[PDB]
mmCIF file of C-alpha atoms and ligand atoms in Angstrom:
data_model
loop_
_atom_site.group_PDB
_atom_site.id
_atom_site.type_symbol
_atom_site.label_atom_id
_atom_site.label_comp_id
_atom_site.label_asym_id
_atom_site.label_seq_id
_atom_site.Cartn_x
_atom_site.Cartn_y
_atom_site.Cartn_z
ATOM 1 C CA UNK A 1 -24.868 181.393 -1.267
ATOM 2 C CA UNK A 2 -23.718 184.449 1.378
ATOM 3 C CA UNK A 3 -24.444 187.116 0.316
ATOM 4 C CA UNK A 4 -22.205 189.683 -1.012
ATOM 5 C CA UNK A 5 -22.267 192.156 -4.128
ATOM 6 C CA UNK A 6 -20.517 190.190 -6.895
ATOM 7 C CA UNK A 7 -21.732 189.442 -10.010
ATOM 8 C CA UNK A 8 -23.059 185.306 -8.455
ATOM 9 C CA UNK A 9 -24.119 186.516 -4.826
ATOM 10 C CA UNK A 10 -25.227 190.680 -5.451
ATOM 11 C CA UNK A 11 -28.564 192.656 -5.024
ATOM 12 C CA UNK A 12 -29.932 191.021 -8.334
ATOM 13 C CA UNK A 13 -30.094 187.169 -6.471
ATOM 14 C CA UNK A 14 -30.960 188.698 -2.357
ATOM 15 C CA UNK A 15 -34.832 187.938 -3.149
ATOM 16 C CA UNK A 16 -34.276 184.385 -3.311
ATOM 17 C CA UNK A 17 -33.093 184.465 -0.287
ATOM 18 C CA UNK A 18 -34.947 186.950 1.596
ATOM 19 C CA UNK A 19 -38.004 187.606 0.009
ATOM 20 C CA UNK A 20 -38.646 190.671 1.496
ATOM 21 C CA UNK A 21 -36.342 192.425 -1.009
ATOM 22 C CA UNK A 22 -39.874 192.588 -3.636
ATOM 23 C CA UNK A 23 -40.949 194.046 -0.330
ATOM 24 C CA UNK A 24 -43.107 197.179 0.459
ATOM 25 C CA UNK A 25 -40.331 199.738 1.962
ATOM 26 C CA UNK A 26 -37.166 199.312 0.247
ATOM 27 C CA UNK A 27 -34.934 201.533 0.896
ATOM 28 C CA UNK A 28 -32.697 202.596 -0.656
ATOM 29 C CA UNK A 29 -34.786 204.749 -3.178
ATOM 30 C CA UNK A 30 -33.394 208.110 -5.845
ATOM 31 C CA UNK A 31 -34.859 210.650 -3.778
ATOM 32 C CA UNK A 32 -36.174 213.067 -6.225
ATOM 33 C CA UNK A 33 -35.617 217.020 -5.854
ATOM 34 C CA UNK A 34 -39.430 218.107 -7.448
ATOM 35 C CA UNK A 35 -41.839 215.133 -5.793
ATOM 36 C CA UNK A 36 -40.586 215.859 -2.944
ATOM 37 C CA UNK A 37 -43.268 217.681 0.343
ATOM 38 C CA UNK A 38 -41.944 219.957 2.007
ATOM 39 C CA UNK A 39 -43.721 219.169 5.286
ATOM 40 C CA UNK A 40 -44.390 222.410 6.869
ATOM 41 C CA UNK A 41 -44.430 219.875 11.107
ATOM 42 C CA UNK A 42 -41.497 218.027 11.099
ATOM 43 C CA UNK A 43 -39.131 219.516 13.963
ATOM 44 C CA UNK A 44 -35.784 220.330 13.914
ATOM 45 C CA UNK A 45 -33.981 216.952 13.965
ATOM 46 C CA UNK A 46 -32.088 216.399 17.714
ATOM 47 C CA UNK A 47 -28.800 215.276 16.914
ATOM 48 C CA UNK A 48 -27.454 214.745 20.455
ATOM 49 C CA UNK A 49 -24.118 213.128 20.346
ATOM 50 C CA UNK A 50 -21.600 214.972 23.102
ATOM 51 C CA UNK A 51 -21.078 211.578 25.296
ATOM 52 C CA UNK A 52 -21.144 208.923 22.633
ATOM 53 C CA UNK A 53 -19.129 205.941 23.454
ATOM 54 C CA UNK A 54 -16.987 204.535 20.580
ATOM 55 C CA UNK A 55 -15.891 201.461 21.070
ATOM 56 C CA UNK A 56 -14.289 199.149 18.642
ATOM 57 C CA UNK A 57 -14.370 199.297 14.465
ATOM 58 C CA UNK A 58 -15.008 196.121 12.583
ATOM 59 C CA UNK A 59 -14.880 194.973 8.733
ATOM 60 C CA UNK A 60 -17.887 192.334 8.772
ATOM 61 C CA UNK A 61 -16.723 190.946 4.851
ATOM 62 C CA UNK A 62 -19.619 194.158 4.056
ATOM 63 C CA UNK A 63 -18.458 197.156 5.594
ATOM 64 C CA UNK A 64 -17.130 198.835 8.008
ATOM 65 C CA UNK A 65 -18.860 199.220 11.631
ATOM 66 C CA UNK A 66 -17.941 201.787 14.376
ATOM 67 C CA UNK A 67 -19.921 200.090 16.839
ATOM 68 C CA UNK A 68 -21.134 202.201 19.954
ATOM 69 C CA UNK A 69 -21.894 201.539 23.213
ATOM 70 C CA UNK A 70 -25.522 201.255 23.297
ATOM 71 C CA UNK A 71 -26.280 200.484 27.898
ATOM 72 C CA UNK A 72 -27.147 203.604 28.021
ATOM 73 C CA UNK A 73 -29.109 206.882 26.146
ATOM 74 C CA UNK A 74 -25.319 208.057 25.691
ATOM 75 C CA UNK A 75 -25.779 209.731 21.625
ATOM 76 C CA UNK A 76 -29.546 209.393 20.528
ATOM 77 C CA UNK A 77 -31.578 210.797 18.082
ATOM 78 C CA UNK A 78 -34.843 212.861 18.547
ATOM 79 C CA UNK A 79 -36.785 214.785 16.430
ATOM 80 C CA UNK A 80 -36.853 215.735 13.644
ATOM 81 C CA UNK A 81 -39.334 212.691 11.844
ATOM 82 C CA UNK A 82 -39.439 210.796 14.867
ATOM 83 C CA UNK A 83 -41.030 210.116 18.358
ATOM 84 C CA UNK A 84 -39.220 208.908 21.050
ATOM 85 C CA UNK A 85 -35.606 208.630 21.896
ATOM 86 C CA UNK A 86 -33.440 206.785 19.126
ATOM 87 C CA UNK A 87 -30.223 205.479 20.919
ATOM 88 C CA UNK A 88 -26.558 204.694 18.447
ATOM 89 C CA UNK A 89 -25.299 201.841 17.941
ATOM 90 C CA UNK A 90 -23.218 201.631 15.060
ATOM 91 C CA UNK A 91 -22.111 203.754 11.679
ATOM 92 C CA UNK A 92 -20.567 202.376 8.151
ATOM 93 C CA UNK A 93 -20.550 203.481 5.388
ATOM 94 C CA UNK A 94 -20.664 202.584 1.444
ATOM 95 C CA UNK A 95 -18.461 203.217 -1.740
ATOM 96 C CA UNK A 96 -17.405 202.848 -4.743
ATOM 97 C CA UNK A 97 -14.840 201.110 -6.840
ATOM 98 C CA UNK A 98 -14.832 204.969 -9.162
ATOM 99 C CA UNK A 99 -15.966 208.573 -7.143
ATOM 100 C CA UNK A 100 -18.735 208.771 -9.529
ATOM 101 C CA UNK A 101 -20.655 205.769 -7.886
ATOM 102 C CA UNK A 102 -20.785 204.149 -4.307
ATOM 103 C CA UNK A 103 -23.831 206.016 -3.051
ATOM 104 C CA UNK A 104 -27.540 203.763 -1.885
ATOM 105 C CA UNK A 105 -29.519 206.770 -1.743
ATOM 106 C CA UNK A 106 -29.204 209.251 -5.370
ATOM 107 C CA UNK A 107 -30.911 212.939 -5.430
ATOM 108 C CA UNK A 108 -32.232 213.283 -8.927
ATOM 109 C CA UNK A 109 -30.298 209.933 -10.133
ATOM 110 C CA UNK A 110 -26.908 211.722 -9.128
ATOM 111 C CA UNK A 111 -24.600 209.164 -7.169
ATOM 112 C CA UNK A 112 -21.950 210.610 -4.664
ATOM 113 C CA UNK A 113 -19.241 208.698 -3.919
ATOM 114 C CA UNK A 114 -19.729 207.144 -0.902
ATOM 115 C CA UNK A 115 -22.629 206.803 1.942
ATOM 116 C CA UNK A 116 -22.979 206.772 5.512
ATOM 117 C CA UNK A 117 -25.386 205.764 8.057
ATOM 118 C CA UNK A 118 -25.940 206.054 11.894
ATOM 119 C CA UNK A 119 -27.629 203.264 13.062
ATOM 120 C CA UNK A 120 -31.056 204.557 15.861
ATOM 121 C CA UNK A 121 -32.869 202.310 17.325
ATOM 122 C CA UNK A 122 -35.823 202.685 19.078
ATOM 123 C CA UNK A 123 -35.693 202.640 22.988
ATOM 124 C CA UNK A 124 -39.216 201.508 24.195
ATOM 125 C CA UNK A 125 -38.250 198.349 22.518
ATOM 126 C CA UNK A 126 -36.000 197.058 24.987
ATOM 127 C CA UNK A 127 -32.867 195.349 22.889
ATOM 128 C CA UNK A 128 -31.807 196.482 18.928
ATOM 129 C CA UNK A 129 -33.069 193.064 18.146
ATOM 130 C CA UNK A 130 -36.751 193.647 20.154
ATOM 131 C CA UNK A 131 -36.410 196.616 17.565
ATOM 132 C CA UNK A 132 -36.308 195.243 14.289
ATOM 133 C CA UNK A 133 -39.718 193.330 15.256
ATOM 134 C CA UNK A 134 -41.513 197.151 15.209
ATOM 135 C CA UNK A 135 -42.547 198.691 12.065
ATOM 136 C CA UNK A 136 -40.814 201.875 13.712
ATOM 137 C CA UNK A 137 -37.784 200.035 15.290
ATOM 138 C CA UNK A 138 -34.798 202.135 13.742
ATOM 139 C CA UNK A 139 -33.418 205.360 12.609
ATOM 140 C CA UNK A 140 -31.109 205.345 9.612
ATOM 141 C CA UNK A 141 -29.246 208.446 9.377
ATOM 142 C CA UNK A 142 -27.965 209.186 6.516
ATOM 143 C CA UNK A 143 -25.007 211.982 4.734
ATOM 144 C CA UNK A 144 -23.427 212.120 1.336
ATOM 145 C CA UNK A 145 -19.815 211.878 0.603
ATOM 146 C CA UNK A 146 -18.645 213.554 -1.700
ATOM 147 C CA UNK A 147 -15.024 213.783 -3.271
ATOM 148 C CA UNK A 148 -12.856 217.533 -3.236
ATOM 149 C CA UNK A 149 -10.973 218.565 0.197
ATOM 150 C CA UNK A 150 -10.297 216.357 3.557
ATOM 151 C CA UNK A 151 -12.417 215.845 5.793
ATOM 152 C CA UNK A 152 -10.297 216.159 9.627
ATOM 153 C CA UNK A 153 -12.780 214.457 11.998
ATOM 154 C CA UNK A 154 -12.914 210.672 8.954
ATOM 155 C CA UNK A 155 -9.246 210.568 9.365
ATOM 156 C CA UNK A 156 -9.012 208.593 12.833
ATOM 157 C CA UNK A 157 -11.188 206.322 11.074
ATOM 158 C CA UNK A 158 -9.261 206.454 7.606
ATOM 159 C CA UNK A 159 -5.802 205.253 9.850
ATOM 160 C CA UNK A 160 -7.429 202.704 11.615
ATOM 161 C CA UNK A 161 -8.399 200.961 8.212
ATOM 162 C CA UNK A 162 -5.387 199.096 7.884
ATOM 163 C CA UNK A 163 -5.616 197.270 10.859
ATOM 164 C CA UNK A 164 -8.728 195.111 10.429
ATOM 165 C CA UNK A 165 -8.445 194.961 6.317
ATOM 166 C CA UNK A 166 -9.851 191.445 6.555
ATOM 167 C CA UNK A 167 -13.495 189.605 7.123
ATOM 168 C CA UNK A 168 -14.064 189.507 11.166
ATOM 169 C CA UNK A 169 -10.789 191.587 12.408
ATOM 170 C CA UNK A 170 -11.912 193.965 14.547
ATOM 171 C CA UNK A 171 -9.489 197.077 16.418
ATOM 172 C CA UNK A 172 -10.537 199.000 19.144
ATOM 173 C CA UNK A 173 -11.725 202.250 18.421
ATOM 174 C CA UNK A 174 -12.988 204.779 22.153
ATOM 175 C CA UNK A 175 -12.964 208.650 22.534
ATOM 176 C CA UNK A 176 -14.153 208.557 18.273
ATOM 177 C CA UNK A 177 -16.693 211.613 18.273
ATOM 178 C CA UNK A 178 -19.047 211.241 15.182
ATOM 179 C CA UNK A 179 -20.161 215.177 15.863
ATOM 180 C CA UNK A 180 -16.921 215.060 13.139
ATOM 181 C CA UNK A 181 -19.163 214.190 10.634
ATOM 182 C CA UNK A 182 -22.146 216.107 10.628
ATOM 183 C CA UNK A 183 -22.692 218.275 7.489
ATOM 184 C CA UNK A 184 -22.703 222.180 8.797
ATOM 185 C CA UNK A 185 -26.745 222.170 8.157
ATOM 186 C CA UNK A 186 -29.132 219.741 9.204
ATOM 187 C CA UNK A 187 -31.919 219.782 6.365
ATOM 188 C CA UNK A 188 -33.247 216.605 5.593
ATOM 189 C CA UNK A 189 -35.390 214.235 3.868
ATOM 190 C CA UNK A 190 -37.271 211.413 4.388
ATOM 191 C CA UNK A 191 -38.915 208.179 4.551
ATOM 192 C CA UNK A 192 -40.057 205.038 5.351
ATOM 193 C CA UNK A 193 -37.593 202.488 4.327
ATOM 194 C CA UNK A 194 -35.681 199.461 5.669
ATOM 195 C CA UNK A 195 -32.558 197.704 6.114
ATOM 196 C CA UNK A 196 -30.261 197.978 2.980
ATOM 197 C CA UNK A 197 -27.992 194.517 3.477
ATOM 198 C CA UNK A 198 -30.093 191.030 4.219
ATOM 199 C CA UNK A 199 -31.945 190.271 5.884
ATOM 200 C CA UNK A 200 -33.646 193.967 4.400
ATOM 201 C CA UNK A 201 -35.898 194.384 7.109
ATOM 202 C CA UNK A 202 -38.794 197.352 7.177
ATOM 203 C CA UNK A 203 -38.188 198.596 10.247
ATOM 204 C CA UNK A 204 -36.469 202.193 9.500
ATOM 205 C CA UNK A 205 -37.771 205.370 9.505
ATOM 206 C CA UNK A 206 -34.663 206.706 6.635
ATOM 207 C CA UNK A 207 -33.633 210.583 7.837
ATOM 208 C CA UNK A 208 -30.954 212.186 4.547
ATOM 209 C CA UNK A 209 -29.411 214.640 5.001
ATOM 210 C CA UNK A 210 -29.112 217.577 1.972
ATOM 211 C CA UNK A 211 -26.176 218.466 2.878
ATOM 212 C CA UNK A 212 -23.082 216.566 1.528
ATOM 213 C CA UNK A 213 -19.780 216.301 3.454
ATOM 214 C CA UNK A 214 -16.650 215.992 1.832
ATOM 215 C CA UNK A 215 -14.412 214.336 2.075
ATOM 216 C CA UNK A 216 -10.472 214.040 -0.032
ATOM 217 C CA UNK A 217 -9.590 212.012 -2.458
ATOM 218 C CA UNK A 218 -7.186 210.444 -0.560
ATOM 219 C CA UNK A 219 -9.832 209.231 2.263
ATOM 220 C CA UNK A 220 -11.960 207.619 -0.315
ATOM 221 C CA UNK A 221 -9.059 206.007 -1.741
ATOM 222 C CA UNK A 222 -8.400 204.200 2.084
ATOM 223 C CA UNK A 223 -12.145 202.929 1.814
ATOM 224 C CA UNK A 224 -11.265 200.895 -1.614
ATOM 225 C CA UNK A 225 -8.255 199.265 0.232
ATOM 226 C CA UNK A 226 -10.612 197.283 2.769
ATOM 227 C CA UNK A 227 -11.258 193.379 1.673
ATOM 228 C CA UNK A 228 -14.297 190.982 1.207
ATOM 229 C CA UNK A 229 -12.318 188.190 2.030
ATOM 230 C CA UNK A 230 -11.395 186.238 5.454
ATOM 231 C CA UNK A 231 -7.202 186.716 5.755
ATOM 232 C CA UNK A 232 -5.725 183.402 3.987
ATOM 233 C CA UNK A 233 -8.649 183.689 1.332
ATOM 234 C CA UNK A 234 -8.116 185.302 -2.165
ATOM 235 C CA UNK A 235 -7.930 188.932 -2.329
ATOM 236 C CA UNK A 236 -11.148 190.970 -2.689
ATOM 237 C CA UNK A 237 -11.645 194.207 -2.714
ATOM 238 C CA UNK A 238 -14.059 196.021 -0.536
ATOM 239 C CA UNK A 239 -15.782 198.551 -3.612
ATOM 240 C CA UNK A 240 -19.394 198.990 -4.551
ATOM 241 C CA UNK A 241 -20.984 197.553 -2.189
ATOM 242 C CA UNK A 242 -24.049 200.042 -2.291
ATOM 243 C CA UNK A 243 -27.903 198.562 -3.475
ATOM 244 C CA UNK A 244 -28.907 199.769 -6.121
ATOM 245 C CA UNK A 245 -32.272 202.292 -5.881
ATOM 246 C CA UNK A 246 -35.203 200.162 -4.811
ATOM 247 C CA UNK A 247 -39.125 201.612 -6.308
ATOM 248 C CA UNK A 248 -40.222 204.135 -4.157
ATOM 249 C CA UNK A 249 -43.999 202.790 -4.752
ATOM 250 C CA UNK A 250 -47.343 203.984 -2.366
ATOM 251 C CA UNK A 251 -44.197 206.032 -0.845
ATOM 252 C CA UNK A 252 -43.841 210.136 -0.149
ATOM 253 C CA UNK A 253 -40.106 211.416 0.653
ATOM 254 C CA UNK A 254 -41.457 214.798 3.044
ATOM 255 C CA UNK A 255 -38.266 217.034 3.092
ATOM 256 C CA UNK A 256 -37.607 219.847 6.270
ATOM 257 C CA UNK A 257 -37.000 222.454 3.519
ATOM 258 C CA UNK A 258 -38.195 224.257 1.231
HETATM 259 N N1 F2B B 301 -26.974 199.972 4.993
HETATM 260 S S1 F2B B 301 -28.882 199.361 6.848
HETATM 261 O O1 F2B B 301 -28.102 201.051 7.530
HETATM 262 O O2 F2B B 301 -30.197 200.297 6.360
HETATM 263 C C1 F2B B 301 -27.982 198.864 7.556
HETATM 264 C C2 F2B B 301 -27.764 199.136 9.533
HETATM 265 C C3 F2B B 301 -28.263 198.435 10.254
HETATM 266 C C4 F2B B 301 -27.724 196.855 9.219
HETATM 267 C C5 F2B B 301 -27.174 195.543 10.930
HETATM 268 O O3 F2B B 301 -27.442 195.734 11.956
HETATM 269 N N2 F2B B 301 -27.487 194.442 10.340
HETATM 270 C C6 F2B B 301 -26.714 193.514 10.837
HETATM 271 C C7 F2B B 301 -28.693 192.453 11.989
HETATM 272 C C8 F2B B 301 -29.999 192.969 11.337
HETATM 273 C C9 F2B B 301 -30.793 191.850 10.949
HETATM 274 C C10 F2B B 301 -30.647 191.542 13.362
HETATM 275 C C11 F2B B 301 -29.977 191.385 13.711
HETATM 276 F F1 F2B B 301 -29.986 190.514 15.212
HETATM 277 C C12 F2B B 301 -28.367 192.326 12.971
HETATM 278 F F2 F2B B 301 -27.217 191.867 13.488
HETATM 279 C C13 F2B B 301 -27.699 196.250 7.969
HETATM 280 C C14 F2B B 301 -28.199 197.859 7.442
HETATM 281 HG HG1 HG B 302 -39.407 195.609 10.939
HETATM 282 ZN ZN1 ZN B 303 -25.590 201.375 5.426
#
């Protein structure tokens, strides 16, 4: 039926309706730190999120997305392995039912409690729709979340989760500053990949940050109270909405640090 993360419609079944699931540049992948190549030609990332305009937060049945106004160059990602300007359109997370799992990407097989994805599209393509038809159409900034001290900047997100508990629900979510979700260091690993959820399009340049951000146990607990189901349907907790690591195949993971 429609794709999900359950036993009968999960990642292992996606290939039936989306053959690209078994493609050549699928994400996420395991990042082997000893095989990753330090590339001195990689420029530092340039995250310019000061003019960011968040609009709303929505439970889409797979995760919750915080959407941004991308009609202009308000919040952009440049530099790093990218050529051109990429506009922030939305961010979301993937998390587990327990603290020891939840991230999509892993580092030396280590799984983190969750993973934040800041989605950006290449402006030379005009709109998000055209960008997903190009090999360099998207750039997703990935950040790992480990359970420890609370992250102040994530609280506004946590507090609003009650209003979007079920699939289809949305709430206004203006003036959110995404800079509060960034770690201190912008060191990263980068490799060409895909969306981690159907349609699994291979249009993404992944930029995974080395330094994870820490959030509290209470903060992550709030994520786990969301529902995959719509209002009135039987309750299915939204947990474990992550895709397991895929074969790296003919790709090399480059590091911006040594
Ligand atoms: N987890 S992740 O960062 O890799 C990821 C990022 C974006 C999307 C997305 O935009 N999906 C909807 C979608 C996809 C293609 C075309 C569309 F029109 C559309 F709405 C999905 C997964
Ligand atoms: Hg593509
Ligand atoms: Zn994602």
